[PDB]
Design a protein around this ligand. Structure first.
Ligand SMILES: *[C@H](CCCCCCCCCCCCCC)C(=O)NCCNC(=O)CCNC(=O)[C@H](O)C(C)(C)COP(*)(=O)O
Lengths: 63, 62
């Protein structure tokens, strides 16, 4: 927890502020991804982190 | 004396030519029957002409 890490003065590399989970549902096949589901989980992560997409400049995709 | 013959001399798709000869409206029915037959063969089970192949289990490999 970031408050406790700051309180104990430990080495901090970076802070994660939001994580989200979503499922594609019934896509075309069992392995087909869903663009809409990906957008939904992006929105959920942005909302949970309390931040705007314009703030983020680097995206590490599954690729 | 020739009796009959059944050799695999199909070669080019006589189906394509016979469909081309037939009026374009017939093309839908013949293609429908061909697809239904082939899909029933590959999926091993008979199928309906309107039910989705997804609900018949047509995977990526299929
Ligand atoms: C994760 C890829 C991990 C695959 C590992 C395979 C392991 C073999 C079995 C493990 C047994 C475990 C033992 C338990 C007792 C991943 O990041 N997925 C790659 C991206 N995933 C996808 O986007 C699916 C990839 N697409 C495709 O390649 C096509 O969907 C396929 C190949 C299904 C064909 O076309 P179809 O979708 O039209």
């Amino acid at each position: 927890r970031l408050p406790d890490a700051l309180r104990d003065g430990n080495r901090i590399f970076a802070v994660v502020r939001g994580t989200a989970t979503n499922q594609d549902g019934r896509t075309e096949t069992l392995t087909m991804p869903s663009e809409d589901a990906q957008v939904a989980v992006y929105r959920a992560a942005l909302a949970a982190a309390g931040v705007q997409p314009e703030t983020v400049g680097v995206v590490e995709a599954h690729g | 004396m020739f009796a009959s013959t059944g050799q695999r001399s199909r070669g080019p798709s006589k189906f394509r030519m016979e469909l081309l000869s037939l009026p374009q409206d017939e093309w839908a029915g013949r293609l429908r029957r061909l697809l239904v037959e082939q899909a029933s063969v590959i999926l091993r089970r008979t199928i309906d002409a309107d039910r989705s192949f997804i609900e018949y289990g047509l995977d990526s490999l299929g």
